[PDB]
Amino acid sequence: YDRKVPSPTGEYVKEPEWVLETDGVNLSEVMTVPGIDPTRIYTNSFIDIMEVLGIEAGRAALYKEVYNVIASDGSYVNYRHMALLVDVMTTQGGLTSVTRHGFNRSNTGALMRCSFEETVEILFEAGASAELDDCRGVSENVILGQMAPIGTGAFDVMI
Amino acid sequence: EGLVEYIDAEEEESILIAMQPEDLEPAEADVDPAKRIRVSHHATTFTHCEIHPSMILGVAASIIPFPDHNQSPRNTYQSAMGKQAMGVFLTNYNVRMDTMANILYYPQKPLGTTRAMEYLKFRELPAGQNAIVAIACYSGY
Amino acid sequence: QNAQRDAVTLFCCLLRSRLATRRVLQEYRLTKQAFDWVLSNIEAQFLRSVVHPGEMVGVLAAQSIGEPATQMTLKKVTSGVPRLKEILNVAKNMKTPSLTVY
Amino acid sequence: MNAPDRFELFLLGEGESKLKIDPDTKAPNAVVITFEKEDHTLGNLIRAELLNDRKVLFAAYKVEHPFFARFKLRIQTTEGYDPKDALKNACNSIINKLGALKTNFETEWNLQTL
Amino acid sequence: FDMGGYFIINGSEKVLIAQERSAGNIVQVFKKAAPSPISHVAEIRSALE
Amino acid sequence: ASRHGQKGTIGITYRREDMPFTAEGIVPDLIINPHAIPSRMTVAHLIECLLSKVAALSGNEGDASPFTDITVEGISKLLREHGYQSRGFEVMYNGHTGKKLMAQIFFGPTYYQRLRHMVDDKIHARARGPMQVLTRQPVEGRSRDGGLRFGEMERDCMIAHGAASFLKERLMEASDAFRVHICGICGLMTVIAKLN
Amino acid sequence: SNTLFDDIFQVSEVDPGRYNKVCRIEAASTTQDQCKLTLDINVELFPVAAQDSLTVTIASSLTRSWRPPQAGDRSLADDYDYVMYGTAYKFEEVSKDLIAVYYSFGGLLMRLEGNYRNLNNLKQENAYLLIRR
Amino acid sequence: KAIPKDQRATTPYMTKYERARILGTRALQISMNAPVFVDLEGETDPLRIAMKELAEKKIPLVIRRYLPDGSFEDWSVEELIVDL
Amino acid sequence: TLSHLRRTNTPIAKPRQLHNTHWGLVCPAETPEGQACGLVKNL
Amino acid sequence: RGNLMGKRVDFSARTVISGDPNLELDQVGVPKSIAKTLTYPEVVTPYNIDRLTQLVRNGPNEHPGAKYVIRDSGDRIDLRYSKRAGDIQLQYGWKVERHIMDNDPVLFNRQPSLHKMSMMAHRVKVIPYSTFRLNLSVTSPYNADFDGDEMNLHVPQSEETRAELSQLCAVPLQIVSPQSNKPCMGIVQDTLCGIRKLTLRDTFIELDQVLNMLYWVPDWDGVIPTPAIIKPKPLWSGKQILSVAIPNGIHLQRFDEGTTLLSPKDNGMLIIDGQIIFGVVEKKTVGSSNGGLIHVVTREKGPQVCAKLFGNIQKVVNFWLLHNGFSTGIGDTIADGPTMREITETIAEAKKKVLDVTKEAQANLLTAKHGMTLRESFEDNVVRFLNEARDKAGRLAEVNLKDLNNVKQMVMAGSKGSFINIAQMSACVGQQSVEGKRIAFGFVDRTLPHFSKDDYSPESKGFVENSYLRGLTPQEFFFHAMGGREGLIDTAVKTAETGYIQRRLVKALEDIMVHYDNTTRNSLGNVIQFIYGEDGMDAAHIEKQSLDTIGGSDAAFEK
Amino acid sequence: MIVPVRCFSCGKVVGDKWESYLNLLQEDELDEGTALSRLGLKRYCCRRMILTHVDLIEKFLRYNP
Amino acid sequence: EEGPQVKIREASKDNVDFILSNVDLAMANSLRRVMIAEIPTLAIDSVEVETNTTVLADEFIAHRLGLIPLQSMDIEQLEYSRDCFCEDHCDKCSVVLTLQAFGESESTTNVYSKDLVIVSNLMGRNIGHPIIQDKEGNGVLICKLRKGQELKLTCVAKKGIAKEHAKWGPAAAIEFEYDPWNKLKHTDYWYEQDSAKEWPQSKNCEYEDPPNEGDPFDYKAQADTFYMNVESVGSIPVDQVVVRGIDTLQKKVASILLALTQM
RNA sequence: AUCGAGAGGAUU
Ligand SMILES: [Mg+2]
Ligand SMILES: [Zn+2]
Ligand SMILES: [Zn+2]
Ligand SMILES: [Zn+2]
C-alpha cells in the first residue's frame, strides 16, 4: 500500500508500506497481536467494529463503507448527506437498520409508520396500545391533506 | 438418404461440429488483410458440419444487416422494435376486420437484405422505406 | 458560542492563511479600500451560505444518496448496488468480510 | 392536430404588417426591421448585398425559430445616412442585378439547340 | 402468406405459447448449502407418458 | 428508428430548400447526428449505408447477411470505380446560405423503420373530468380524460423543495377534498349534519 | 498615441504544431544577446520560414465598434505586411535585471523577453503588433 | 407563554421559505383587490407587485418562528434582513 | 406475426442467462428486454 | 400508499418530448392543444379586466381564452355553450378560468423522479406541434434524451402555489445542485462537440459571419470587437466572439498537462474578464463540472445571469457549427495498414503468450501464488494477459488516429464516448464475461461443440480476436452474445433493487429538517445533528478550495 | 403497392417509369444496373425509388369483388 | 451586357447545365431556394369521390393525383383561388378534371393520367394538360383494376407553391457546385493518405485552372462562377423555371420596396 | 362501469 507522509524536512513524501489483506474476520483476536498497529488496523465489517471499538467508531466505519461504495464508481456526494444517513442509523443506541425491524418501529406516531411497510398491524396494535399521534411529520399531514410543517410550512404568518 | 441428421442438445454433447464446410476440412498446403481472423482447422474427428452459422439467429435478428459487426444489446433492441415496425402485415387486410392495423403507403424491400429475409418472406412484405439519411451535425435538433 | 467557535474552525484555517500579513501585501498587493471590501464581501457572502430553517434535509439526503446508486451497473470485494443493500440491512451474513492489517 | 397550416408561411394573418421597423437602443443610428412571412431565401440576400455598400457599419439577420416565418434585420450606418435608404439603395441594387441576369440568360438560351 | 399455427376463439386469433419445464425422469445431483444438514441430493421427477 | 436499436423520434422538418444538399443536387430524407455513433458502437448502421449506396448504384442487392467475406475495403473499392470517395463522404452545401461545408458528411441510402408509438396518441391533458366511485379521486388511463398520478415518489421531490402549499393543493383542491363534521367529545364522524 | 517598441528579429524555428492555419515561431533579436521572442503567426496569411528576418513593432493607437475599413481614404499605421491586435496578461520576472511580457491576440500568443521595455510595454488593455518584410 | 423582544438567536435574515411565502401570502391579498401600499410604477402582476412592496419593507405581516420545544419568536417584515 | 408463433415461456439458479447449450435452438439475441427478460425465448 | 401518499390529480398533462435549441433554459414548449385545456383561476381585479374581459370574448377555442366564468353566487358559467357566452360583464371579484399563456409557472417532471431536480418550474412558451419542447441543456436533471420518453406538467391554482414554484422550484435556482456542490445542468451534444471546434486556434471567422453571430446573442451591446487579425485580412478568432457570450468579471484559471502560460498544446484554460485569453473550450470548462464556468457565473453574477448564459453559449455555438458541419463515416473507424499489422502482431504475441503459460501450467511448473488455487492463479494469469493485449492494441490505434477524425474528435471534446469505444470499434474487442468469469463450460469440458474437450486457450474461452469493423466470427458472436446478455439482465432487476433501496432511504429520513435553532431533527424532536453537516452550511454554496497551510516544506512555509 | 409518382428525396416523377422498367429486364434481357440508367435515373435517390419498389398491387387484385 | 453572366453548355427540354459568372454567392443561392420552392404551379388539390372499388383506398388515390404533373405554362395568368372573388372554385381560378375508368376485361386494366379529362372552360389558355414524357404516351400510373371495379373522381386543380406542398414544386433536382479545387478552402478534406488520390476530380475541373504547388493561399479572393444545372418535372419547361425564378425572387424583393413606400 | 390477466413504452 502507497502512503503519503511527512519528511522531517517538511514536505509530504511517498513512503510505501506493506499491508496485509484478509479473508474473513475476528477483530477481537487480531488486533491483540504482536508487531501490528492496534490503533490503525481496519476491517470492512462495520458490525464487528461496532462490537469492539463501540458505537462512535461504528459510525465512522459504516460511513467509510457507504462512501467507498459511491466513490468506487467515480461518483461524489457531499459528505453532509451520507453523514446524515449514517448519523441517523447511529443515534438510537446501536445500529438501527433501514428496514421495518429497524427504524420503522421506533416510537413515532402511527399514521407515519402506516405509510411504510406493515400497514395494518401498525394500525392494529396502535389502536390497542392506544397511541396518541403527534402530527408533526410530513406523512401525517399528507394523509389529512394539510400544509405539512415543511419549509414554506415551518412557521405561521400573523398580521 | 442420410445426408442430414436431427441432433438435440443432449445428444449434441458427444459430437464435434465443423463451421465452414469448405475452408475447414480440405488440405493444409497470400492473405487479404481486410478478412477477419478465422481461427483454424485444429480438429480431425469431425462428425457433423453445421449448415450455416447464420442460423443460430431466430426470425427477428435474421433481419439485421450484419449483426456480426455489432454488439449484443442493440441486436436484441432491434429485435424488440422490428416487432413494432409497420407495413404490409397481411395481404387480405382489406377483407379482415381486426381492431387496429397499420399499413405503409409505399413499403420497400430494404437495399441490404439478409439471406433469411428470403424465407421470412420479408422482401415481399417489408416494413420500412429505404430513406436517404445524413449523419452530420446540423441546425440544432 | 462554544459550538459557533468550533463550527467555523475549518473555514478559518483557510481565511487566516489567505489573509496573512506577508501574503496580502506581497503576493496580491491589496490596498486599504480593497481590503475593507474584501472583508465586507466575505462576511456577507459567507452569511449567505448558512442552511435555511425550513429546509427538509431528510428527503434531501435520501435522494442525494439514491440517484448515483441508480447509476451502477457492471480485485474481489462486494461492491456496487449489492454492497449498498448489504450495508443498509446491517447485514450479519456479509459475502466479503476482511481485515486489513497494519 | 396542433399543426399550423402551411399557408401560414407566405400569407399574412391579421393586424400583421409585412414590415415592422424599430430603433435600436444599444447603438446610435441603428435599426432592426422585422420581416413577416420571409426567411433566408430573402434575408441572407438583403444582408450580403447590404455589406457591399461602403457606407454601412453593421448588417445582420436571424431566423429566431424555424416554426415561425419571421426573421429580423439589424443595420447600422454612417452619420446622417438613414438605415431605410441603406435598405432601399440595397434592395434596388439586387433587382438591377437580377434584371440583367434575366436578360443575359435569355440571349444565351436562344442561341443553343434542343 | 398467413402461416397458421394459431386457433380462432370468438373471432380472435389465439396462439399457444411453448411452455418450458424441467425434464421428467432424469437423475440430477444437487450440492446443498452451508447451513443445511443435507450436503447432496439426487432428484427425479417421475411421470408416465 | 433505424434497424440497430438506434431508435428516435422526429424533431424538426425542414423543407427541401433550407436542408443541406450535395453537389449532385440531392436532398436527404432525414438527418441524424454523429453522436448516435460512438457510445452505442453500432457500426453496422453506417456500414449498411455505405454498402447500400453501392446497391442503389450498381443496381444490385446488398448482401448484408452475417458471416461472409465482405469488407469495408471491398465495398470501398467498388464506390471508388463508381464515382465517389471510398468511405461514404460527400461534399455537402448548407441550405440557408449555400456556403460550402467546411466538413464533408456521411450520407447514404439506409433502411429505416417507421415504428408504432404515435405522438398524437399520448398527448393527454386534464382539467377536472370524471371521478372514481370509491375514492372521489380522478380516473386512470388517458382514455377516460384521465388524471396523472402525482407520484408518492414525486411527493418526495416536493418535500425536497420545501414547497408545502403546492403539496396541499395538489392533494385536495383537485384529487380529493371533502368537508366532514366532527364531534368535540367523541372524536369521530357520528355527527348527523341536518344542515340548513 | 505612439510606438512602444521596435526590433529586427532572426527566425530560428518553425513549428507546424498539429496545425494548418497557425504556427508558433521562435525568433531572437539581432544585436542584444539578452533577448528572445516566441510568437503565434497565421502561416496562411503570411508565410514565415527558418532563417528569415522580420521587423517587429507594438504601438497602441494606429473603444467603439470597429468600423469596417473604407481606408484607401484614411491613415493606416502600416508599411507593414501583417498586423494583429491583442491583450497582455502577466509580466514575468526571469530573476535579474530581466523581464518578459505575455500577449494574447484572441488565442494566438506572444512571449517577449528583455529589460529596457520596463517604461514602455504597459499593463495595458491596448497593444497592437506589427510585422513586416 | 412567548419569547422576549430581545434574547433572539434565530437567523435575523429571511429564509427563502419565509420570503417565498411572504410574497405569496400578500400576492394573494393583492390579486383579490385589497389595498396596495406602494406606487405601482408600471407593473400589474400581483406577485410582481408584492416583490416591490417587499423591496420597500412595507408588508405588514409578522413571521412566527416555531422552535422545537414549542416556544416561538416574532419578526415584522421590517426587522428581517433580505439578502439572497 | 411470425415472431410470436415461435415463442417460449418459462415459469417464475441462473435461468436468465443465454447458456452455452442454447446455440442453435434459441436465438442468441431475440429476447424481450426488461420485465421478464431472458426467460422468454424465440427459437 | 396508493390513494393518500399518491393521488391521481387534476390540471396536468403529458406528451412526447423534444429538444428546442432556440428556447431559453427556464422554458417549456407546451403545445397549443394542451394549453388549450388546462386552466388557472384568476380574479377580476382593476389591473386585469382589460386583458381578462377580452379573453372571455376570445372564447374557449382560439388561443388566449377561457372556459368557465365564476360569480358572486359561486355558480358556473360554461363558456363553450351558454346563451350569454359573447356577453358577460366581469363584475369585480369573479374568477375567469383562462388558458395557460406565455410566461407561467409549470411544474415539469419525469419518472422515475429521484431528485428535487427531477422536478422543477419552467416558463411556458405555447407552440406548434403536439409535443413538449425543452432546452437541451435541461436534459440532465430530468434525465432522458429524445428517443421517446414522455414528461408531466402540473399547472398550479393558488397565487402562492405559483410563487412557491417560481421562487423555490424554478429552474435556474437548480443549476448548482446540493447533491454534489457543483452544477447539474451543463451544455452538451453538438454545442460542446462544436464549442471545441469554434475555439481551436486554427478557427478564424471573417466579417460576414461575425456580424450575424454577434447579432445572434440577445444581450450584445452593439460594439464589434476589434479583430485579432487586422493584417492582409480582417479576421477574428473563434474564441474572440464566443467571448461575447461570457459576461464581465468572470475569471477562470486551469492548467492541465503541458500548461505553461503559453500552452503549446492550447492545453488548460485562462479566462480574464468577459474575454478568453488562451485555451481550448470543452467539457472541463463548460461541462456541469466543479471548477468550470457555470459553477462560477452562477455564484458570481446570479442564477438568472447564469441561466441566460446557457442559451447564449448555445445560440452562437450551434450557429457557427451549422455552417461548419460534423459527422461520422465508417472512415472514422478505419486504421492504417501498417498499424492494422502492428495490432495483429500485438495480438499474436499475447495469444502465443497464453499458449506458453498454459504449456507451462500443464507440466506442473506453475507456482501457486499464496492463497489461491493452482487453477485460480492461471485464470488470473490469462485474463490479465489478454485484457492487456486489447488495451495495448486499442491505444496502438488511438496513436494511429489523425486529428480530423470525427470520433477521436467527439472524445476530444468529451461529447460522447471514451477510449474503449474506439479500442473495440477499430482494433480489438477483448474478453467476454459472465459472473466475472471468462466463458463457461456448458457442454461437458468444452464451450461449443465446434471444439475439442479440455481446450483452455482464449479463442475457446471467449476472446473476440477481431474488431467490429472487421466482423466477429460465429463463435465469437455467440460468446459476446452470452456477454451483453448479462447487461440486459441487470438493468431489468438491478433497477428494482435500486427502486426499493430508495423507497426505504426516503421513508427513513423524511422529516429530518433543519429547525430554526440550526439543530437537525425529526418529528419527535430528537437531535440527529446539533449543526447541519457539522457546520450549518447549505451544500449548494460550497466549493473545493485548497488549504495550502497543509502542504509545502517547513522551509517553504516560512518563506 | 402501386409504384410512386415522384421520389420522396429528389422529385423526378417516377410514375411513368415502372412499366418501362419491367419490360427492359425480361424482354431484351438486361441487368437491373444498366436497365435503370436507360431511363434517365442517375441520382441514386431516384434510382432506388424503382429498384426497391415492391409491387403488391398485383396481389391485392387477386381478391375477388 | 453588364454583369451577372450566364452561359449554357448543354441544355435539353429538362436540363440546362450552365456556368454563372460574376455573382454574389448569396443570390446564386437565394435563386435556387426561391426556385425549388417559390415559383407557382397548378396541381390537383381537391378530389370529389363518387364510387371507388379499387384495392387502394380513397385518400390514397387522391394523394396520388396530387403529384401527377399538370401543364403550368400559361399559369401566371391563372388566379389564386384564395383571391378570386368566387365561392370555392371557378374556371377563373381552377381547372376541374374528370377521371372515370372501369374494370373491363380479364387482363388487368390500368389507369394512366392519360385517362384524365379536362372539363372547365380553359378560355383557351394553356393549363391542366396532364404532362406525358412517357414514350408509349401514358401519363404516370394512377392505379390498377381487375374485372369489376369502377372509380369516379373530380379533381380541381388550383394554383399553389412548393412552400405549401412539394406537389406544387416544378423543379426537382438542381446541381450546384462552386470552386472545384478548393482554391477558396471553404472545405477541409477528410483523408488517409493523398487528399488528391482519394477524392474525385469533379466534371468541373476543366473550367478552372489547377493551383500549382508554389503559389501561397489566395486570401482576399471570393466566390465567382457557379456550376449549375436545372432539371424540370416539366409542368413548366426548363428555360422558364430559371426564368420564373429570377423573376419571382425579384418580385418578392420588390414587394419590400413597395412595403417601405406605404409606411 | 367494476374486478382479473396479458402485450408495450421510458431509465442504454
Ligand atoms: Mg428516453
Ligand atoms: Zn360524539
Ligand atoms: Zn431521386
Ligand atoms: Zn374562383
PDB file of N, CA, C and O and ligand atoms in Angstrom, chain L residues 84 86 88-90 93, ligand 4:
ATOM      1  N   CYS L  84     -59.404  35.167 -55.998  1.00  0.00           N
ATOM      2  CA  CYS L  84     -60.629  35.164 -56.812  1.00  0.00           C
ATOM      3  C   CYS L  84     -61.901  35.322 -55.982  1.00  0.00           C
ATOM      4  O   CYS L  84     -62.069  34.677 -54.942  1.00  0.00           O
ATOM      5  N   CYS L  86     -64.909  34.329 -56.287  1.00  0.00           N
ATOM      6  CA  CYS L  86     -65.963  33.313 -56.270  1.00  0.00           C
ATOM      7  C   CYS L  86     -65.874  32.439 -55.039  1.00  0.00           C
ATOM      8  O   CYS L  86     -64.815  32.315 -54.443  1.00  0.00           O
ATOM      9  N   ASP L  88     -65.770  28.847 -53.283  1.00  0.00           N
ATOM     10  CA  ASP L  88     -64.910  27.731 -53.754  1.00  0.00           C
ATOM     11  C   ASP L  88     -64.224  28.002 -55.112  1.00  0.00           C
ATOM     12  O   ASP L  88     -63.620  29.057 -55.293  1.00  0.00           O
ATOM     13  N   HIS L  89     -64.314  27.072 -56.055  1.00  0.00           N
ATOM     14  CA  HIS L  89     -63.577  27.205 -57.302  1.00  0.00           C
ATOM     15  C   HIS L  89     -64.413  27.738 -58.476  1.00  0.00           C
ATOM     16  O   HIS L  89     -65.629  27.522 -58.526  1.00  0.00           O
ATOM     17  N   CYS L  90     -63.756  28.434 -59.409  1.00  0.00           N
ATOM     18  CA  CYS L  90     -64.333  28.771 -60.728  1.00  0.00           C
ATOM     19  C   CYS L  90     -63.266  28.681 -61.824  1.00  0.00           C
ATOM     20  O   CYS L  90     -62.075  28.764 -61.519  1.00  0.00           O
ATOM     21  N   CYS L  93     -60.402  30.564 -61.455  1.00  0.00           N
ATOM     22  CA  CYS L  93     -59.321  30.124 -60.558  1.00  0.00           C
ATOM     23  C   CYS L  93     -58.805  28.657 -60.713  1.00  0.00           C
ATOM     24  O   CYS L  93     -57.695  28.331 -60.267  1.00  0.00           O
TER      25      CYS L  93
HETATM   26 ZN    ZN N   4     -62.827  31.485 -58.494  1.00  0.00          ZN
END
